[PDB]
Design a protein around this ligand. Structure first.
Ligand SMILES: CC(=O)N[C@@H](CS)C(=O)N[C@H]1[C@@H](O[C@@H]2[C@H](O)[C@H](O)[C@@H](O)[C@H](O)[C@H]2O)O[C@H](CO)[C@@H](O)[C@@H]1O
Ligand SMILES: CC(=O)N[C@@H](CS)C(=O)N[C@H]1[C@@H](O[C@@H]2[C@H](O)[C@H](O)[C@@H](O)[C@H](O)[C@H]2O)O[C@H](CO)[C@@H](O)[C@@H]1O
Ligand SMILES: [Zn+2]
Ligand SMILES: [Zn+2]
Ligand SMILES: [Zn+2]
Ligand SMILES: [Zn+2]
Lengths: 167, 167
C-alpha cells in the first residue's frame, strides 16, 4: 500500500537529477558563473543551492549526516561560506562566492540523489505523516517537507534552464 | 491507504497555485509581456503555458473537458492562437501573442487548480498505475504523467519568478 507514494517521490526526485544532467552537460566555467544582473543567481548557485536544500532536508528527516560533510564535498568545493550554508537568504556578495566546476556540481547532486533514493525506498504512510521538529513554527509533516524540497528544487532547476537560454 | 499519495499530489499542486498568486501581484502588462531577450519567454507566456499544460493533461487523464474551453477562458483571453494551443513548440513570434491581464492569467490557473484537486480527490493506487501512453518507452502511467506536470509547471513558474527579479 506504500508503493504508490514511494513511486511518486522516486519519480519526482529523479526528474530533478535528470535536469542536473541536462544543465551540466557541456557547462563551462563562464556560463556556470554568469549572472544577468549583479543580484541575480547563476547556474552554479542554482545547482549548488538545490543540492544543498535537498541534502540538508532529506538528511534531516532520514536522521543521517548530510552528504556535503559525510563525503567531504564541502571541502572539495572550498566555498568562502559557512560550512552548512545552503544559500537560503544569500545576498549578492554571497552568490558570487559559489564557484565550482560542473563535474563537482553534478557529483554532489548525484550523491544527494543516492541518499534521497535510499530514504524513499523505506517510505511508509506512517513516516509521511510523522511531524518534523524545526525552528519554523509551525512544524510540518515529512510529506510536506518532501513536497517543499521538490517544489524549491524544480523551480531553481527551471531557472537554471532559462538562464542557459537568455545568456 | 490512498490518502498518502492523494496528499502528496494535493500539496504539490497547491504550491503551484500559490506561486501563481505571488507572480501576479503587481504584474503590469509591461512586466507580464517583458522578454529579457527577443526570443525569451515572458511571464505571461510562462503563466499561461503552465496552466494550459496542467489543464490539458489533467483533463485527459481524468476524462473530462479542459476548463480552458468548458468555462470559456479561451474566449475571455481572445489570443490569436489555435483554440487548444498550449505553447509547446512555440516560436518567438508565437510567444509574443500570449498577452492577457494578470487577473485573467490568475483566474484561469485557479480554475485549472480546482479541476486538478477534483481529480486528485478520487485518486487510487490502481489509477496511479494505469497506462496512459503505451507507445512511449517506458510506458507512461498516470503517476508519471502527473509528476511530469508538476515538474514542468514548477520549472516554468520558477522561471517566471526569476524573470520578475531581473526585469
Ligand atoms: C524558488 C525560490 O525562490 N525558493 C526560495 C527558498 S530556498 C529561495 O531560494 N530564495 C533565494 C533566492 O531568491 C531569489 C530572489 O528572490 C530573486 O529576486 C527572485 O527573482 C528569484 O526567483 C528567487 O529565487 O536567491 C537569493 C539569493 O540570490 C536568496 O536570498 C533567496 O533566499
Ligand atoms: C521546462 C521546459 O522547458 N518544458 C518544455 C516542455 S512543455 C517547454 O516548455 N519548452 C518550451 C519552452 O522552451 C524554452 C526554450 O527551450 C529556452 O531556450 C529555454 O531556456 C527554456 O528553459 C525553455 O523552457 O519555450 C519555447 C517557446 O519560447 C517552446 O518552443 C518550448 O516548447
Ligand atoms: Zn558543523
Ligand atoms: Zn531555494
Ligand atoms: Zn479545437
Ligand atoms: Zn513547458
Amino acid at each position: 500500500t506504500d508503493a504508490a507514494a514511494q513511486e511518486l517521490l522516486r519519480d519526482a526526485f529523479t526528474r530533478l537529477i535528470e535536469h542536473v544532467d541536462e544543465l551540466t552537460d557541456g557547462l563551462t566555467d563562464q556560463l556556470a558563473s554568469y549572472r544577468p544582473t549583479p543580484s541575480a543567481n547563476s547556474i552554479a548557485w542554482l545547482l549548488w543551492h538545490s543540492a544543498r536544500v535537498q541534502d540538508i532536508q532529506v538528511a534531516h528527516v532520514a536522521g543521517v549526516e548530510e552528504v556535503w560533510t559525510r563525503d567531504g564535498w564541502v571541502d572539495r568545493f572550498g566555498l568562502d561560506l559557512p560550512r552548512h550554508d545552503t544559500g537560503y537568504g544569500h545576498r549578492p556578495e554571497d552568490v558570487a562566492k559559489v564557484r565550482a566546476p560542473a563535474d563537482l556540481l553534478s557529483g554532489y547532486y548525484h550523491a544527494v540523489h543516492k541518499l534521497t533514493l535510499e530514504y524513499i525506498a523505506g517510505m511508509t504512510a506512517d513516516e509521511l505523516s510523522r511531524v518534523v521538529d524545526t525552528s519554523w513554527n509551525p512544524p510540518v509533516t515529512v510529506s510536506a517537507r518532501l513536497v517543499s524540497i521538490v517544489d524549491d528544487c524544480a523551480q531553481h532547476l527551471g531557472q537554471a534552464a532559462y538562464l542557459r537560454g537568455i545568456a
